[PDB]
Write a protein that binds this ligand. Structure first.
Ligand SMILES: *[C@@H]1O[C@H](CO)[C@@H](O)[C@H](O)[C@H]1NC(C)=O
Ligand SMILES: *[C@@H]1O[C@H](CO)[C@@H](O)[C@H](O)[C@H]1NC(C)=O
Lengths: 151, 195, 196
């Protein structure tokens, strides 16, 4: 598994994500982003999940983030150009994470993540994926790439 | 139809991605070349109508694959797409680390400076891009041409038990054991140990 | 109410700083709360800083605090018989506005080699950041300072030492924190002594 390279992202890539996050937040200022349930805010951290379950949890969160951001980019061209490089990088990370993974908290989290797109407004979904972007890229992705070291 | 560019390649040392092509023969006049990179799903464009046969793609993302394309145009007519694929993580060429060797009596103290990335900052070097980065040092006495190899754990090493009043040449390179990729050797620096 | 209220960052932590009101009595007391950009409705109050008179409050880690999004704080002066309106500071994004502190150097003189490690008193809840330290080394009385390459945190700096002894050599270290752009810190106070 070649995910260990995502323990730290290049500062230039983090600058691109910051530009995208700012642009998305500016668009959110106008859109109505009210959620029926705070699905993205995660009470527990991947560290609590077993080292084997941390990847699948991150994969579902990353897939939702990518899906919502992809739709946002298609809806607004002004967001499309700034979100292009972030979306490309996120998809590459998603491919590596999937190519890395050959009841409890995890099952409920997966079910909630799957049911969220079909029960929540797109605006609040994009708000949640926007405000969780650096949470996913600095706190989760780092622990998943670290592997056994993260504890 | 105007001819497409010939020998389109991407030389990228220390993530300094440069697309080069040779301008095909055209007696009508000078040719202007446009280059594009497939960002996500849409082809964004750089180096529009560039008279030069060189384009800079170092602004590309360092993670994942990229699809680049270049073409030549004379007024309205244009060439065909010449499409290549570039993977910066492994298609890049690892440059030679800088070397600082000091003779201390009968020993050599060598410090290795990681190959810098111009697009990135002095903190983000090629040592941090590759988590499996290590240094390989190759030293030999002049004349015998019998190379000896060591693998320092950090960017500093000491060679001891050296014959006195004798000159040794040394080189250092970066290596990635998890993928078995080696950078180019530094220029051999030769230093004399005396008493 | 406080005149200038600033949410600043230093030593890897965040603080709220204010100044006494112009007409506020000496028995002035202050209450401070914080809010996050994701949730504009919630205004959770800082328990440790509640009822403090210190013009400085620490908002490094509080209950249900997100350091991955920008957050702001507000402070009000609570008189024994009256309360002033809250005065809110500016938003502070931790991952882009945190000021690193200089590292603590640990020196070990091995035969013909000086090893200088950097240790950090990081907050327990600080996000995982990229910390590197550059080491300047020189001789007292001379302006020629040799500046060594940046070294990742958790890895010592090895300086070659000449056989010469009874010499005045001094060292300093500067932290470079890199998330999107490098933020430098002041060089640590030169703690040095005779070697060998
Ligand atoms: C607040 O800052 C201003 C500068 O804009 C300064 O004139 C004033 O004295 C400060 N307030 C106090 C109480 O010092
Ligand atoms: C240097 O310090 C780091 C932590 O600050 C430690 O992990 C490492 O083992 C130390 N290296 C030494 C003492 O050589």
């Amino acid at each position: 598994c070649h995910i260990a390279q995502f323990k730290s992202l290049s500062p230039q890539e983090l600058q691109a994500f910051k530009r995208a996050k700012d642009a998305l937040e500016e668009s959110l200022l106008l859109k109505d982003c009210k959620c029926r349930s705070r699905l993205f805010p995660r009470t527990w951290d991947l560290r609590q999940l077993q080292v084997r379950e941390r990847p699948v949890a991150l994969e579902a969160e990353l897939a939702l983030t990518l899906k919502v951001l992809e739709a946002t980019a298609d809806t607004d061209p002004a967001l499309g150009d700034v979100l292009d490089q972030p979306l490309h990088t996120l998809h590459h990370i998603l491919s590596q994470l999937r190519a890395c993974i050959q009841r409890g908290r995890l099952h409920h989290w997966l079910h909630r993540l799957q049911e969220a797109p079909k029960k929540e407004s797109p605006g609040c979904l994009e708000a949640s994926v926007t405000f969780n972007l650096f949470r996913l890229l600095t706190r989760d992705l780092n622990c998943v790439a670290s592997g056994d070291l993260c504890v | 139809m105007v001819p497409p560019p010939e020998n389109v390649r991407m030389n990228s040392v220390n993530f300094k991605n440069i697309l080069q092509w040779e301008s095909p023969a055209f007696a009508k006049g000078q040719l202007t070349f446009t280059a594009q990179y497939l960002s996500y799903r849409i082809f964004q464009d750089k180096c529009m109508q560039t008279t030069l046969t060189e384009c800079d793609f170092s602004s590309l993302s360092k993670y994942g694959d990229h699809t680049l394309r270049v073409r030549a145009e004379f007024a309205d007519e244009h060439s065909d797409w010449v499409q290549i694929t570039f993977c910066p993580v492994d298609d890049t060429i690892i440059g030679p680390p800088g070397m600082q060797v000091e003779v201390l009596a009968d020993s050599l103290h060598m410090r290795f400076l990681a190959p810098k990335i111009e697009n990135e900052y002095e903190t983000w070097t090629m040592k941090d891009m590759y988590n499996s980065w290590t240094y390989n040092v190759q030293y030999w006495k002049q004349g015998t041409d019998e190379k000896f190899q060591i693998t320092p754990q950090y960017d500093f090493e000491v060679l001891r038990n050296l014959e006195p009043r004798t000159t040794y040449c040394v080189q250092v390179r970066g290596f990635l054991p998890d993928r078995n990729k080696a950078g180019e050797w530094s220029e051999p620096v030769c230093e004399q140990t005396t008493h | 109410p406080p005149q200038n209220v600033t949410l600043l960052s230093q030593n890897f932590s965040v603080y709220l700083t204010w100044l006494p009101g112009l007409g506020n009595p000496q028995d002035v007391t202050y209450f401070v709360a914080y809010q996050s950009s994701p949730t504009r409705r919630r205004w959770r109050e800082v328990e440790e800083c509640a009822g403090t008179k210190e013009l400085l409050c620490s908002m490094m880690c509080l209950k249900k605090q997100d350091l991955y999004n920008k957050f702001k704080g507000r402070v009000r002066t609570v008189s024994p018989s009256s309360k002033s309106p809250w005065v809110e500071s500016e938003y502070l994004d931790y991952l882009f506005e945190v000021e690193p502190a200089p590292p603590v150097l640990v020196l070990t003189q091995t035969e013909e080699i000086l090893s200088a490690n950097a240790t950090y008193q990081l907050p327990p809840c600080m996000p995982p950041l990229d910390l590197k330290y550059e080491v300047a080394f020189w001789k007292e009385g001379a302006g020629n300072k040799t500046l060594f390459p940046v070294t990742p945190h958790g890895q010592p700096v090895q300086i070659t030492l000449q056989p010469a002894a009874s010499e005045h050599h001094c060292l300093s270290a500067r932290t470079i924190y890199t998330f999107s752009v490098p933020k430098y810190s002041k060089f640590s106070k030169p703690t040095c002594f005779l070697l060998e």
